[PDB]
Amino acid sequence: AKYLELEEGGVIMQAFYWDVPGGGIWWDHIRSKIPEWYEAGISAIWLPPPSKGMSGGYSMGYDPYDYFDLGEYYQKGTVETRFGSKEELVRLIQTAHAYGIKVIADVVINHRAGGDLEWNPFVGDYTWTDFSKVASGKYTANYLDFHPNELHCCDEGTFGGFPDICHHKEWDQYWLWKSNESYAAYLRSIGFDGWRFDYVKGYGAWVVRDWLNWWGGWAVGEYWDTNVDALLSWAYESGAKVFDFPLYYKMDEAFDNNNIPALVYALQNGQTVVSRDPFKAVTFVANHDTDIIWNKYPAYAFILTYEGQPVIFYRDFEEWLNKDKLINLIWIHDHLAGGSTTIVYYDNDELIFVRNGDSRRPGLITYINLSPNWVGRWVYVPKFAGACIHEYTGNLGGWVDKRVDSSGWVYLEAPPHDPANGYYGYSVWSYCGVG
Ligand SMILES: C[C@H]1O[C@H](O[C@H]2[C@H](O)[C@@H](O)[C@@H](O[C@H]3[C@H](O)[C@@H](O)[C@@H](O)O[C@@H]3CO)O[C@@H]2CO)[C@H](O)[C@@H](O)[C@@H]1N[C@H]1C=C(CO)[C@@H](O)[C@H](O)[C@H]1O
Ligand SMILES: C[C@H]1O[C@H](O[C@H]2[C@H](O)[C@@H](O)[C@@H](O[C@H]3[C@H](O)[C@@H](O)[C@@H](O)O[C@@H]3CO)O[C@@H]2CO)[C@H](O)[C@@H](O)[C@@H]1N[C@H]1C=C(CO)[C@@H](O)[C@H](O)[C@H]1O
Ligand SMILES: [Ca+2]
Ligand SMILES: [Mg+2]
Ligand SMILES: [Mg+2]
Ligand SMILES: [Mg+2]
Ligand SMILES: [Zn+2]
Numbered sequence: 001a002k003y004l005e006l007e008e009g010g011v012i013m014q015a016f017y018w019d020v021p022g023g024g025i026w027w028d029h030i031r032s033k034i035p036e037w038y039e040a041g042i043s044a045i046w047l048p049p050p051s052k053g054m055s056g057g058y059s060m061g062y063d064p065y066d067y068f069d070l071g072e073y074y075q076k077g078t079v080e081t082r083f084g085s086k087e088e089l090v091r092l093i094q095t096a097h098a099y100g101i102k103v104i105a106d107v108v109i110n111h112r113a114g115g116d117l118e119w120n121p122f123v124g125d126y127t128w129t130d131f132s133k134v135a136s137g138k139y140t141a142n143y144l145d146f147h148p149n150e151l152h153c154c155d156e157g158t159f160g161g162f163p164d165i166c167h168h169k170e171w172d173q174y175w176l177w178k179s180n181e182s183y184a185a186y187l188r189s190i191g192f193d194g195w196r197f198d199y200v201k202g203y204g205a206w207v208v209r210d211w212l213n214w215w216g217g218w219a220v221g222e223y224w225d226t227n228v229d230a231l232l233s234w235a236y237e238s239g240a241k242v243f244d245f246p247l248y249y250k251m252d253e254a255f256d257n258n259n260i261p262a263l264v265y266a267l268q269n270g271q272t273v274v275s276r277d278p279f280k281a282v283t284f285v286a287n288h289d290t291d292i293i294w295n296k297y298p299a300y301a302f303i304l305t306y307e308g309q310p311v312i313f314y315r316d317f318e319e320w321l322n323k324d325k326l327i328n329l330i331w332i333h334d335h336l337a338g339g340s341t342t343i344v345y346y347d348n349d350e351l352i353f354v355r356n357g358d359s360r361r362p363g364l365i366t367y368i369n370l371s372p373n374w375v376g377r378w379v380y381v382p383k384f385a386g387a388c389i390h391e392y393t394g395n396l397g398g399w400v401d402k403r404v405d406s407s408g409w410v411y412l413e414a415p416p417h418d419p420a421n422g423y424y425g426y427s428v429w430s431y432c433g434v435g
Contacts, residue, residue, distance in 0.1 A: 001043040003334035006102040006194065006218050010043025011304070011330050012311045018288040020048075020083075022057055024071070027084030031092040033318070034099055040323075041330040044102035044218070046196050046311070048288075050081065050089055050187075052135075054114030057082050060288075061106065062198065063162065065114030067175075067183045068136035070190075075135040076114060093191035102193040104218070107183075109176055110202030111162035112141065122148045129163050139175035139183065157202040167207045177211040184215050194218035197240065201225065205237035212239050220282045231273050235280045244281040244308065247272040248293075251285070251302065255295040258370050260351045263302075264343060278307035286313040296321060297419055298351075298368045301426040304329035305337045305355065305366040325424060328393055336364040336392065336430045344379050352412065354381055365389070365429040369414040382408030388432035395424050401432055 004010035015030045030045065037045070049061025052069035056076030061083075065076060070086040072079065079085065084092075093103050116130035120143040131141040146163040147154045158164045165172055177184035197208055200221035212219055219240040223231050226246050235242045250272060254263035267275040274281035283303040285296055293299050296316060303310040304326075310333065317326050338361030344352040349370040357363030363383065369375045385408035391400040395415045404410040417425025 001041070001100045001102075002038055003041045003331070004043055005100075006044040008043075009309045011041060011333060012044045012046055012104070012282075012309065013037055013042045013317065014284075014287060014311050014313050015045045016048040016288065017313070017315050018060065020060075022082045024057070024078075024080035024082070024084040024088070026082070027088040027092045031088075031095050034092075034095050034101065038099035038101060040317075040327045041334055042101060042312075044104055044194065045096055046104040047089075047092075047106060048083060049106045049108045049198070050083070051108075052076055052078075052081055062108055063113035064108050065112070065131070066134040066136050066138075068138040068186060069134070073135035090190050097191060102218070103191060104194040104196050104220075105187045105192040106196045106198060107187075108198040109165060109167075109183075109207070110157070110199045111159045111164055112146075113162050115141070115163060118142060122150070127163065138181070141172070145169055145172050155203055157199075159199055159202055164202070167203055173210070177214055184211055188215055188217075192217075195220070195240075197221040199224075200234060200238070205234050208238035208240050228271055228273055228276060232276060232280065235273075235277070241280050241282050241309070242273055243287075243311075244273040244283045247274055247281070247283055247303075247308075248285075248290075251299050252293045255298045255302075255370065256293060258348050260346050260348060260368075260370065264346045264351070268343075274306070274308040281308040282311060283308040284311040284313065286316060287311075291315075295370070295417070295425075297325065297424045298370060298417065298426055300326060300329055301366065301368055301424075301428070302351075304333045305364060305428060306353070307341060307355075322419075322424070325393075331435075332364065332392055332428050334361075335435060336361050336428070339363050344381060345377070349417075350375060350377075350414075352379055354383060356383060362431050362434060364392075365412065367412050367414040367427045367429070369425045370417045372416050372418050374413065374416055376411055376413040378409055379412050380408050381410060384408065384410070384429075384431070389429045390432040390434075392428050392430060392434075393424075393426065395427050402429075 052066045053059025054063040057078040071081040072086040115128040118130035120127040129143045194217045250266040270276045285299040338358035339356035342354045351368040355363045384404045386406045414427045416423040
C-alpha cells in the first residue's frame with residue numbers, strides 16, 4: 001500500500017453496496033478504481049461474496065449456492081455472477097496486489113441457498129437441501145449438512161428461511177476450510193488475503209477460530225449487536241475483529257442530533273468496541289445493510305482521526321461525498337493519527353480531542369463542529385506546548401499555522417458545519433513540517 005498496510009491498521013474500502021449495477025461489470029469496474037484508490041492511500045478492499053448464488057445474475061452473493069463457482073459455470077441462469085466472471089475477479093485481485101492493496105473475501109457460511117428439493121427425514125418434510133448438482137462438483141451437500149440433524153436441532157442462529165449449515169459435521173468443515181481443497185483454500189489460492197465473516201451470530205466462534213488457525217490473515221466478523229460485551233466475547237473467542245456497531249449507533253445519536261455528549265459518554269464508559277479494545281474494532285460510517293448517519297463529514301473525521309481501524313463506504317467515496325476530504329482524512333489517519341486519546345473539550349455541538357502519538361505518527365488535535373457558524377476557543381494542549389502547529393485539512397480556507405505558548409494554550413478554530421454550502425465542520429492540527 002502507499003501508506004499503512006492492512007495489518008498495520010490501514011484504511012479499508014468497502015468496494016460495493018447493495019444492488020450494484022449487474023451484468024457482470026462490477027469486478028472490472030472496481031479494477032478500474034484500483035490505481036485511484038492506491039493514490040488515495042487505501043490499504044485493502046472488501047469485495048462482496050464472490051460465489052454463484054441462488055438468484056444467479058441478481059444475487060448479491062449472500063445466498064450462496066455453489067461456493068466453488070466464482071463466475072465460470074453455467075447454472076442459475078448465468079455463467080458470470082452478478083459481479084463478473086472468475087477470470088475478471090482474479091484479474092481484479094491480482095491488480096489490487098500489483099498496487100500493494102490487499103483483498104478481503106466476504107465469507108457467507110451460516111447458510112446456503114438455491115438447493116434442490118429433497119425429502120428430509122429429520123424434518124419430516126421436503127427441504128431445499130439438495131446441493132448434489134452444483135456445477136463445480138465441489139462441496140455437494142444434503143439434509144445431513146443442515147439443522148436440524150442427528151447431532152442437534154439447531155445452533156446459535158438462523159437467517160430467514162435459508163438452510164442453516166451445521167459446521168459440526170466433518171464434511172462441512174473439510175469443504176469450507178479444513179483442507180487444501182476447501183473454500184478457504186480456493187479463495188486464498190486466487191489471492192484473497194483476509195476475511196469478512198457474514199452473520200457470525202449464526203454459528204460458533206470456534207468456526208472462525210479454526211478457519212484462522214488454518215489460513216491466518218486479517219479477519220473481521222459481522223456480529224450485529226449493540227452489546228459490547230457480546231461483540232468482544234465473540235472477538236476473543238474467534239480471534240477475529242468485529243465491526244463496531246455500538247460506535248455506529250452512537251455516532252448517529254451524536255452527529256445527527258447535535259448531541260456529541262452521547263458519543264463521548266459511550267466512549268468513556270466502554271460502550272463502544274473501539275474504546276474497550278481499539279485493536280479489535282473495525283469502525284465505519286455506513287455499509288450495504290445500514291446507512292442512518294446523515295451528517296457523514298464529522299463521522300468520517302471522527303473514525304479517521306480516532307482509534308480503531310476505519311472502513312470507507314464505496315458510495316461515500318465514489319459517489320456522494322467530497323472525495324478530496326476523504327483523501328485528506330486518509331492521509332491524516334496514516335501520518336498523524338496515532339497513540340492514546342485525550343478528550344480536550346465537548347458539548348452539544350463541539351468535540352476536541354488529542355491523539356498523543358506513537359512511534360510513527362506524531363499525534364494530532366481534532367476539532368469537530370456541528371454548528372452552522374465558525375467556532376473558536378482556547379484549549380489546553382501541553383503536548384504541543386511551545387510548538388508550531390499547522391491545520392492539515394484546509395477547511396479553514398487556506399494555509400493556517402499557530403504558535404502554542406510555553407504553557408500549552410492555543411486558540412483553536414473550526415469551520416461551520418454546512419456541507420450544502422461547502423463547509424465541512426472540522427479542522428485537524430499537528431506539528432508543522434510533517435508533510
Ligand atoms: C497501529 C495501531 O494504531 C492504533 O492503535 C493505537 C491505540 O488505539 C491507542 O490506544 C494506543 O495504544 C497504545 C497502548 O494503549 C499501550 O498500552 C501500548 O501498547 O502502546 C500503544 C501505542 O503504541 O496507540 C496505538 C498505536 O497508535 C489503532 O487504533 C490500532 O487499530 C492499530 N493496530 C494495527 C496494528 C497491528 C499490529 O502491529 C494489529 O494488531 C491490528 O489489527 C491493526 O489494526
Ligand atoms: C457423502 C456424504 O458425506 C456427508 O454425510 C455424512 C454425515 O455428515 C454424517 O453426519 C453421517 O451421517 C450419518 C448419521 O450420522 C447417522 O445418524 C445416520 O443418519 O446415517 C447418516 C448417513 O446416512 O455420515 C454421512 C456419510 O455417510 C455429507 O454431509 C453428505 O452431504 C454427503 N452426501 C453426498 C451424497 C449424496 C448421494 O447421492 C447427495 O445426496 C449429497 O449431495 C452429497 O453431498
Ligand atoms: Ca446457524
Ligand atoms: Mg463480465
Ligand atoms: Mg441518522
Ligand atoms: Mg458549543
Ligand atoms: Zn450443527
